[PDB]
């Protein structure tokens, strides 16, 4: 299968500059060279150039609505184009708002896809529930078909068309949810595994259940959106919103290993890696490294070892 | 339900001064302001003033028997008074010897209560088994009805009346027990889950079993005595006796989340937080913070999120 | 049962000097004095003196073949001698190459023994698969009967005689395996539990299964070879090849506790503790300490507590 890496150096989805440096950091750490050594064909598309919208005035509380809106429409066009050529897309964030474009362009080709969202946050705040106007916490609000018409039309997002429903998305790692958000997921009935559920069942049971829930009936493509702040701050500290009590390096790799074994991975997002939020040069390498490990794991790398087929090592 | 915080700035239960600063540290971190934001009514009673007994001579090996004895009789009177007004009591330690008063005053109103003890130690050393004379490691020895008359009468504790039996107390987190103690719990048959049991069954199974064991038949009030050194030193380092291989931040929050879901929480002790034993200013904030989190969790705060009933966030 | 500690201050199995200091560090930390306080009889044999072979030229890629070969033949003679006197042997590494002699001498008395290998590596590289010539990553290649004749005869190992087969060895903790190695274990069908298997089943299930696999039919002696780098670098950092995502202090103590409960422990290796690779004096004490804890756990020490039989502590 072919792989294409698409860099999205965007940070207008939140107040913390530096996230747009994520893609460069992940390459510097050799992400693309390490993927070539797997069983997949890899091509690096490069970084999209995002045009900054002049006089992008705030729409009520939301900030940079036109800049974030345009950025995502441009990304969505690239993802669909590549998805079309029969290739698995790999999106390197900046901030989580880029999830809008990524999933949108993906669904245009595979409208029957399912989303697995690993994050410490649900990011399902609408333009009216948000205490802040940062769009990195509203990504899933622009994608749900059960939320369409539940909030005004934001300047720059007219092109967006709800592509997935509450029943097509499972959350793993939740531990810092806002009131309005916890309301939306209880109301719409979204399947989720917060940290208490992981603690209760174990990572194994969790993955065994998210699959039967999504792939139980039909076998459809999988889009994995991975917010680096889903793992515990001790593992991925260089991020804008770290929260204690997260998934461990081991649990993170287990998820991806199980997702690889399905053979259905079609889309991937490595979001929120902010190289500038490292307290020490090493806290940044730690973050960059585990993110790289999570991507290599998604494409074949196992902890038990790997060896080439038809080669007699003895 | 109403909540009342009672501060017990006492440290005579052991040689390490500084524990009496625990209550002040927990307030400074905003414990009381954060509880008001829950669904409970909160009132801060303040800190009890403990009269130091002059010429409090050692009773054989035990130290400060009259000072610790008086301190606890004074606490027991406050707890019963507040328990009486139909309020859940929240005791902020100093040292673990204050468990005596806390549980005593509690049982006077609810003689049919059960105790869940989270700690790395059993603290069931009697005045004769103790290698040290510190009374913070003898709290549960003054409360058991199966131990009454098994050790002389210590000056200052004549008012104490055994209020619970071996079958009414479950230990979770045990990993540093003395020989004499491990004997007393095997003899009296106390239900316990040491770290090996947690590792074997998982935090979920552990809680599922402590409940059926205690609440299986009758539904009685629950008294949670939480010794901060039950969590691993990496999470709660500012304590007098840290021991590697403890419960994790996640497991700690799971316990309380399950205890909240019962609706039976009637008493609470946050013991052994010693602000002065922090190697760095941050090791102390880490300890204070997780302790605060454990108390908010006990009263409704969930990791999956919380939202106010009857409010339409959409 | 009697115990005999044998020190193997050897480091020729790899490029990192300092490992030969392991045995001294573990004694300094009081390993022998703490074992005497258990229910076992302990005798300290001392450290073997290893003669350095002059002009020990490299055999193709392998380094120090004659020095490592001789060292192990000398160790195997001591282990068999002591095993013969009906005593459990305890080998204190240097490097993992000393596993050759240790297991060899052991099997000479108990040819029906089984091996439990706790390590982050399989160390089953043959003289032809190794990317490096270091023999610490080839120990298991000189012991398997299914590999005999699959690689030339290395100078210094003519005395070695394959003593165990693929079906008699279980690996726990794998997470950094070379291609050729992962090939050998898939081909020969070696039973293993890498980190993903531990994550999936839990330490309890893992131990429950390694036992039924090995002791299911016949009850045979157990040889536990423990490579300190099997535990996560946060617990045992002073080692030549640390790898993130390992077993925890708790899991490590659980394994040994279960192994003790079998009553079949006959051999023990505490390998790869390198006192000189500590970044700080404390990273070395942390390593030394957990290793000491693992050995005391192997011989009776439980986390739930221990008390002497026939003594009435009340
Ligand atoms: Mn997030
Ligand atoms: Mn997110
Ligand atoms: Mn205590
Ligand atoms: Mn304690
Ligand atoms: Mn090894
Ligand atoms: Mn190793």
DSSP string, A54-82: TT---BTTB-SHHHHHHHHHHHHHHHHHH
**C193 phi/psi in degrees, rounded to 5:** -130, 100
Domain that holds residue B42: 1-314
Reduced to 3 states (helix: H, G, I; strand: E, B; else coil), residue C57 is coil
Scanning A261-303, the segments in alpha helix (DSSP H) are: 281-298
Q: Is C201 on the interface with A (CB under 8 A)?
A: yes
**Distance between alpha carbon C234 and the CA centroid of its chain, in Å?**
20
Decide: A204 and A254 in contact? Cβ < 8 Å. Answer: yes
What lies within 8 Å, CB to CB, of A310 at 6+ separation is none
What lies within 8 Å, CB to CB, of B67 at 6+ separation is B12, B50, B52, B53, B56, B156
CB-nearest to C249 from B185, B194, B244 is B244
Q: How far is CA A43 from CA A32, A81, B185, C31, in A?
A: 8, 14, 64, 55
Decide: B107 and B266 in contact? Cβ < 8 Å. Answer: no
Return d(Cα B177, Cα B192) in angstroms, integer. Answer: 12
Q: How many CB atoms lie within 10 A of CB C165?
A: 14
Burial tier of A168 (Cβ tally within 10 Å: 0-12, 13-18, 19+) = buried
Indicate the DSSP class of residue A300.
T
CB contacts, 8 Å: B180 with chain C: 307, 313
Return d(Cα A264, Cα B125) in angstroms, integer. Answer: 59
Phi-psi region of B46 (alpha: psi -120 to 50; beta: other; left: phi over 0): left
Indicate the DSSP class of residue A312.
-
Q: DSSP strand E in A131-178: where? A: 169-174
Angle between helices A99-107 and A65-84 (to 10 degrees): 40
Decide: A126 and A181 in contact? Cβ < 8 Å. Answer: no
> Which are the residues after which chain C is interrupted (C to N > 2.5 Å)?
none
The C-alpha torsion from A174 through A176 and A180 to A182, rounded to 10°, is 30
Overall size of chain C counted in residues = 314
Return d(Cα C95, Cα C83) in angstroms, integer. Answer: 22
Helix or strand (DSSP H, E) at C172: strand C169-174
Reduced to 3 states (helix: H, G, I; strand: E, B; else coil), residue A116 is strand
Contacts 24+ apart (CB under 8 A), A200-203: A200/B203, A200/B204, A200/B254, A201/B204, A202/B202, A202/C202, A203/A247, A203/A250, A203/A251, A203/A254, A203/A255, A203/C199, A203/C200
Return d(Cα A73, Cα B259) in angstroms, integer. Answer: 47
Nearest ligand to the C-alpha of residue C123?
A: 5
CB contacts, 8 Å: C197 with chain A: 304
Query: Smallest Cα–Cα separation from A132: which of A63, A53, A180?
Result: A63
Return d(Cα C251, Cα C257) in angstroms, integer. Answer: 10
Scanning A85-202, the segments in alpha helix (DSSP H) are: 99-107, 179-187, 195-201
CB contacts, 8 Å: C245 with chain A: 249-250, 253, 303
Q: What is the C-alpha radius of gyration for chain A, rounded to an integer number of angstroms?
A: 18
Please report the residues numbered 242 through 301 in chain C whose beta carbons come closer than 8 angstroms to any beta carbon of chain B.
Answer: 249-251, 253-254, 257, 290
**Distance between alpha carbon B172 and the CA centroid of its chain, in Å?**
12
Return d(Cα C62, Cα C131) in angstroms, integer. Answer: 10
* HEC profile of chain B: CEEEEEEECCCCCCCCCCHHHHHHHHHHCCHHHHHHCCCCEEEEEEECCCCCCCCCCCECCECCHHHHHHHHHHHHHHHHHHHHCCCEEEEEECCHHHHHHHHHHHHCCCCCCEEEEECCCCCCCCCCCCCCCCHHHCHHHCCECCCCCCCCCCCCCCCCCCCECHHHEEEEEECCCCHHHHHHHHHCCCEEEEHHHHHHHCHHHHHHHHHHHHHCCCCCCEEEEEEHHHECCCCCCCCCCCCCCCECHHHHHHHHHHHHCCCCEEEEEEECCCHHHCCCHHHHHHHHHHHHHHHHHHCCCCCCCCCCCCCCCC
> Number of folded domains in chain B?
1
As a 3-state breakdown, chain C gives helix, strand, coil percent values, each rounded to 5, of 40, 15, 45
Decide: B92 and B270 in contact? Cβ < 8 Å. Answer: yes
Surrounding residues of ion ligand 6, Cβ less than 5 A: C 119-121, 227, 229
Q: How far is CA B206 from CA A34, B292, C192, in A?
A: 43, 23, 28
Return d(Cα B307, Cα B62) in angstroms, integer. Answer: 50
Overall size of chain A counted in residues = 314
- Chain A residue whose CA is closest to B307: A179
Reduced to 3 states (helix: H, G, I; strand: E, B; else coil), residue A246 is coil
Q: What is the CATH number of the domain that holds A198?
A: 3.40.800.10
Reduced to 3 states (helix: H, G, I; strand: E, B; else coil), residue C117 is strand
Indicate the DSSP class of residue A194.
E
Q: DSSP strand E in chain A: where? A: 2-8, 41-47, 88-93, 114-118, 169-174, 191-194, 222-227, 265-271
B150–C307 C-beta distance less than 8 A: no
A222-227, strands of its sheet edge to edge: A41-47, A2-8, A88-93, A265-271, A222-227, A114-118, A169-174, A191-194
C254–B196 C-beta distance less than 8 A: yes
> Which are the residues after which chain A is interrupted (C to N > 2.5 Å)?
none
Return d(Cα A277, Cα A286) in angstroms, integer. Answer: 12
Rounded to 5°, angle at Cα C195 from C194 and C197: 70
Return d(Cα B98, Cα B96) in angstroms, integer. Answer: 5
Largest CA distance in chain C: 68
Helix or strand (DSSP H, E) at C187: helix C179-187
Q: How many CB atoms lie within 10 A of CB C161?
A: 13
Beta-bridged to residue C39, according to DSSP, are none
**B260 phi/psi in degrees, rounded to 5:** -70, -45
Q: Which chains touch C (3 or more CB pairs under 8 A)?
A: A, B
What lies within 8 Å, CB to CB, of C268 at 6+ separation is C88, C89, C90, C91, C223, C224, C225, C226, C295, C298
Helix or strand (DSSP H, E) at C227: strand C222-227
């Amino acid at each position: 299968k072919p792989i294409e890496i698409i860099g999205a150096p965007f940070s207008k989805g939140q107040p913390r500059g530096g996230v747009e440096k994520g893609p460069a950091a992940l390459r510097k750490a050799g992400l693309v060279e390490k993927l070539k050594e797997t069983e997949y064909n890899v091509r690096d598309h490069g970084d999209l150039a995002f045009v900054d919208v002049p006089n992008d005035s705030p729409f009520q509380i939301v900030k940079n609505p036109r800049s974030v809106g345009k950025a995502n429409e441009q990304l969505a066009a690239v993802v669909a184009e590549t998805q079309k050529n029969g290739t698995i897309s790999v999106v390197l964030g900046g901030d989580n708002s880029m999830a809008i474009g990524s999933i949108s362009g993906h669904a245009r080709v595979h409208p029957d896809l399912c989303v697995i969202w690993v994050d410490a946050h649900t990011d399902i705040n609408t333009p009216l529930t948000t205490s802040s106007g940062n769009l990195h916490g509203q990504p899933v609000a622009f994608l749900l078909k059960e939320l369409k018409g539940k909030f005004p039309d934001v300047p720059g997002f007219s092109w967006v068309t709800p592509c997935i429903s509450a029943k097509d998305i499972v959350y793993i790692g939740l531990r810092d949810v806002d009131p309005g958000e916890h309301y939306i997921i209880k109301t719409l009935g979204i399947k989720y595994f917060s940290m208490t559920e992981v603690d209760k069942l174990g990572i194994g049971k969790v993955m065994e259940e998210t699959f039967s829930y999504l792939l139980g009936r039909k076998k459809r493509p999988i889009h994995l959106s991975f917010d680096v702040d889903g793992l515990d701050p001790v593992f991925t500290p260089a991020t804008g919103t770290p929260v204690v009590g997260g998934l461990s390096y081991r649990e993170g790799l287990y998820i991806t290993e199980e997702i690889y074994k399905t053979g259905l991975l079609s889309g991937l997002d490595i979001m929120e890696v902010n190289p500038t939020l490292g307290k020490t040069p090493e806290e940044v390498t730690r973050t960059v490294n585990t993110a790289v490990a999570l991507t290599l794991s998604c494409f074949g790398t196992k902890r038990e070892g790997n060896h080439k087929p038809e080669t007699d090592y003895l």
